[PDB]
Amino acid sequence: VTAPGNEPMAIPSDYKLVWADEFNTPGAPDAKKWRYDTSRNKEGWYNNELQYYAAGRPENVRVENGNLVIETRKERLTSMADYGGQEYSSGKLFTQGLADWQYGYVEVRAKLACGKGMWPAIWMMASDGSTGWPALGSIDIMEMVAWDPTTIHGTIHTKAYNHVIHTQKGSRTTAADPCGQFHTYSLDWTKDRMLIGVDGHAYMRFDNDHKGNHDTWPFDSPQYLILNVAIGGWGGQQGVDAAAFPSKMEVDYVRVYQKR
Length: 260
Ligand SMILES: OC[C@H]1O[C@@H](O[C@H]2[C@H](O)[C@@H](O)[C@H](O[C@@H]3[C@@H](O)[C@@H](O)O[C@H](CO)[C@H]3O)O[C@@H]2CO)[C@H](O)[C@@H](O)[C@@H]1O
Ligand SMILES: OC[C@H]1O[C@@H](O[C@H]2[C@H](O)[C@@H](O)[C@H](O)O[C@@H]2CO)[C@H](O)[C@@H](O)[C@@H]1O
Ligand SMILES: [Ca+2]
Known about the structure:
Layout: E1 4-8, E2 15-21, E3 35-36, E4 51-53, E5 61-64, E6 67-74, E7 88-90, E8 92-94, E9 104-111, E10 118-126, E11 138-143, E12 151-157, E13 169-174, E14 183-189, E15 193-198, E16 201-207, E17 223-231, E18 247-259
Parallel strand pairs: 4-7
Antiparallel strand pairs: 1-16, 2-18, 3-8, 5-6, 6-7, 6-18, 8-17, 9-14, 9-18, 10-11, 10-17, 11-12, 12-13, 14-15, 15-16
The structure holds a molecule of 3 linked components (GLC-BGC-BGC), a molecule of 2 linked components (BGC-BGC) and calcium ion.
A molecule of 3 linked components (GLC-BGC-BGC) is lined by residues 46-47, 119, 121, 123, 132-133, 138, 140, 143, 157, 163, 230.
PDB class: hydrolase
Keywords: glycoside hydrolase, transglycosylation, endo-1, 3(4)-beta-glucanases, metagenome, hydrolase
Assembly: monomeric
């Protein structure tokens, strides 16, 4: 654990809600809130991932009974022009080009996708990607890899601190039955520090060293939100269990708060 935290977190009293998706409207995700990422479907995704992210496909991404559903399936979507030979479909949504935030408290209430292979994620990347990944700054509010389905991972990545060179700043905790019950996954991002937590408890803290070095604090510019369920890579360490499909992440809401 390279970014340990141990402190409470809660929506600050002096913040207001500035953005939410409550997933109130069944059917397609609200196109004024979310866009689909298809950028690497034909080529194969990063992290040796095994999914095809289907855009506009209710089988993988839909709003039902007040929840977003991102569902993994074992199927070859060979009719898709951007199909890349994948054995699985899934979803990836982001607020890129629609909404982003510099600082804030982000709360996502979600039930995660289980089964060996599954890699549900709730994360952020900087809107200004001119420095490339990883320099632009990424915030993993929640990852879980379903070979270890009770373990919630909270991580940030920067030019200096990232998984490629094993310097990522992260921590972890566990939660009761994360695929069977909702928990709140939360980020408290200020100019001084990030806390990442579950159910009101920060288990991860990453401070701004205030050295003005973009390499170690790229987080004084806006980030957009990403929701996806990857398959394989880190999620596939103990293989991809065909019996687990279909598997779904349900997201009751995303709420963003900022200094009133
Ligand atoms: O390998 C260089 C290419 O990286 C691309 O960026 C990827 C990166 O490869 C990938 O490891 C990273 O994966 C994410 C994790 O770092 C973490 O943030 O959690 C995410 C959700 O689980 C996980 O996807 O994603 C990067 C962004 O897709 C660059 O896009 C590319 O230009 C570069 O050549
Ligand atoms: O593989 C990408 C994945 O890397 C994760 O980093 C560490 C992780 O913190 C640690 O718990 C595990 O044992 O090693 C991995 C790979 O070095 C990182 O936490 C994620 O954000 C990232 O998606
Ligand atoms: Ca809801």
